[PDB]
Design an enzyme around this catalytic site. Structure first.
Site, mmCIF file in Angstrom:
data_model
loop_
_atom_site.group_PDB
_atom_site.id
_atom_site.type_symbol
_atom_site.label_atom_id
_atom_site.label_comp_id
_atom_site.label_asym_id
_atom_site.label_seq_id
_atom_site.Cartn_x
_atom_site.Cartn_y
_atom_site.Cartn_z
ATOM 1 N N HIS A 43 0.833 -1.201 0.000
ATOM 2 C CA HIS A 43 0.000 0.000 0.000
ATOM 3 C C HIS A 43 0.868 1.251 0.000
ATOM 4 O O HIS A 43 0.349 2.328 -0.290
ATOM 5 C CB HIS A 43 -0.978 -0.025 1.175
ATOM 6 C CG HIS A 43 -0.401 0.297 2.513
ATOM 7 N ND1 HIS A 43 -0.008 -0.679 3.409
ATOM 8 C CD2 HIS A 43 -0.150 1.476 3.128
ATOM 9 C CE1 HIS A 43 0.459 -0.108 4.506
ATOM 10 N NE2 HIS A 43 0.390 1.200 4.360
ATOM 11 N N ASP A 99 0.057 -7.600 2.048
ATOM 12 C CA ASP A 99 0.556 -6.230 1.869
ATOM 13 C C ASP A 99 2.080 -6.187 1.816
ATOM 14 O O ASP A 99 2.759 -5.913 2.810
ATOM 15 C CB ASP A 99 0.009 -5.364 2.998
ATOM 16 C CG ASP A 99 0.210 -3.880 2.804
ATOM 17 O OD1 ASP A 99 0.670 -3.457 1.719
ATOM 18 O OD2 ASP A 99 -0.100 -3.150 3.773
ATOM 19 N N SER A 198 4.166 2.817 7.974
ATOM 20 C CA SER A 198 3.834 1.920 6.887
ATOM 21 C C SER A 198 5.065 1.428 6.130
ATOM 22 O O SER A 198 5.915 2.246 5.785
ATOM 23 C CB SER A 198 2.894 2.587 5.868
ATOM 24 O OG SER A 198 1.678 2.958 6.492
HETATM 25 C C1 LIG Z 1 -7.411 -0.468 6.324
HETATM 26 C C2 LIG Z 1 -7.407 0.156 7.733
HETATM 27 C C3 LIG Z 1 -6.821 1.593 7.662
HETATM 28 N N1 LIG Z 1 -7.148 2.284 8.931
HETATM 29 C C4 LIG Z 1 -5.313 1.482 7.475
HETATM 30 O O1 LIG Z 1 -4.690 1.182 8.489
HETATM 31 N N2 LIG Z 1 -4.694 1.702 6.284
HETATM 32 C C5 LIG Z 1 -5.462 1.864 5.044
HETATM 33 C C6 LIG Z 1 -4.346 1.638 3.987
HETATM 34 C C7 LIG Z 1 -3.087 2.169 4.730
HETATM 35 C C8 LIG Z 1 -3.258 1.507 6.124
HETATM 36 C C9 LIG Z 1 -2.441 2.186 7.189
HETATM 37 O O2 LIG Z 1 -2.816 3.268 7.622
HETATM 38 N N3 LIG Z 1 -1.325 1.584 7.678
HETATM 39 C C10 LIG Z 1 -0.542 2.334 8.657
HETATM 40 C C11 LIG Z 1 -0.658 1.769 10.075
HETATM 41 C C12 LIG Z 1 -1.319 2.534 11.043
HETATM 42 C C13 LIG Z 1 -1.455 2.068 12.352
HETATM 43 C C14 LIG Z 1 -0.926 0.822 12.707
HETATM 44 C C15 LIG Z 1 -0.261 0.041 11.751
HETATM 45 CL CL1 LIG Z 1 0.396 -1.524 12.221
HETATM 46 C C16 LIG Z 1 -0.132 0.522 10.441
#
Ligand SMILES: CC[C@@H](N)C(=O)N1CCC[C@H]1C(=O)NCc1cccc(Cl)c1
Ligand code: NA
Ligand code: NA
EC number: 3.4.21.5
Lengths: 251, 28, 10
Positions: A43, A99, A198
């Site tokens: 992502h 992912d 991320s």
């Molecule tokens: C699908 C649930 C959405 N809230 C999400 O987390 N997304 C949508 C796509 C990007 C990803 C993200 O933000 N990942 C970052 C993240 C935030 C908090 C904790 C973790 Cl482990 C990872």
């Protein structure tokens, strides 16, 4: 990272920063798994609901970093992307299953005190270490809280969480390609990944050969450091087949 | 690679970072 | 907010 701490110099020498050329900015975390390959979350590059579909030319890779915003002259090294590889069955549509992505670099990066690759688990390390209660370490330059930006690489140690607990914490459909981590409301201590973290590494240090292994990739969460909620991580050993396929066929 | 997972400024010099023992003690 | 990277690397 939320309720994390400042990284020691040289503590995470595999940590990579996905960097946006124009406008110059942090895109995501990533990791160095050899002198030409960087591992990250899918992502970070492709997420159609948010109108994200980056190409090589859009990005730069910054290795050996400590400071978030500063250009660390003589210390960091910035690489250009040769090719991006996204898992062909990455599920951005439902739950972000699988992912994961690979990024082949244009030229080999030179190791140093500040730059060094992490290992990827074999089946026996995964089996021995992917256990509820065993703690891992996740790092990155993301937000300090759900609602800010740290001056240096942040670090937090978090316990792997029992699968039923993971599933009962969310309405999202969870898979074998995922694990969750974080403390229970019970356990008092806290901490989590957050936006900008991320694609960054969840690592463990094997007590067997004293080497650091990347078990997980920062993938998703519902909020950040939310009570009763957990960070979810791409299961890297579960997709190791795909990884050596990609590496075994493109140089 | 094969020197993987060993950090120059810690494992190669046999130094510990400040919280890796939290990891160890959890590997119960 | 980011310090300018060298014009090279692009
Ligand atoms: C699908 C649930 C959405 N809230 C999400 O987390 N997304 C949508 C796509 C990007 C990803 C993200 O933000 N990942 C970052 C993240 C935030 C908090 C904790 C973790 Cl482990 C990872
Ligand atoms: Na559920
Ligand atoms: Na939580």
């Amino acid at each position: 990272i939320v309720e994390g701490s400042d990284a020691e110099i040289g503590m995470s020498p595999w940590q990579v920063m996905l960097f946006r050329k124009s406008p110059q900015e942090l895109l995501c975390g990533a990791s160095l798994i050899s002198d030409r390959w960087v591992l990250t979350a899918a992502h970070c590059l492709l997420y159609p609901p948010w109108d994200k579909n980056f190409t090589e030319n859009d990005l730069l890779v910054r290795i050996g970093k400590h400071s978030r915003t500063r250009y660390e002259r003589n210390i960091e090294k910035i690489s250009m992307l040769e090719k991006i590889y996204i898992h062909p069955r990455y599920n951005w549509r439902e739950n972000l299953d699988r992912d994961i992505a690979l990024m082949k670099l244009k030229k080999p990066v030179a190791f140093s005190d500040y730059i060094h690759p992490v290992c990827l688990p074999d089946r026996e390390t995964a089996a021995s270490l992917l256990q509820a209660g065993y703690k891992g370490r996740v790092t990155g330059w993301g937000n300090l809280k759900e609602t800010g930006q740290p001056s240096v690489l942040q670090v937090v140690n978090l316990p792997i969480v029992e699968r039923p607990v993971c599933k009962d914490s969310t309405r999202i459909r969870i898979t074998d390609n995922m694990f969750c981590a974080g403390y229970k409301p019970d356990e008092g201590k806290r901490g989590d990944a957050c936006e900008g973290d991320s694609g960054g590494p969840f690592v463990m240090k094997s007590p067997f050969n004293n080497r650091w292994y990347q078990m997980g990739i920062v993938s998703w969460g519902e909020g950040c450091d939310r009570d009763g909620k957990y960070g979810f991580y791409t299961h890297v050993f579960r997709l190791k087949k795909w990884i050596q396929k990609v590496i075994d066929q493109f140089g | 690679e094969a020197d993987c997972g060993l950090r120059p400024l810690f494992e190669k010099k046999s130094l510990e970072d400040k919280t890796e023992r939290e990891l160890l003690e959890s590997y119960i | 907010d980011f310090e300018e990277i060298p014009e090279e690397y692009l």
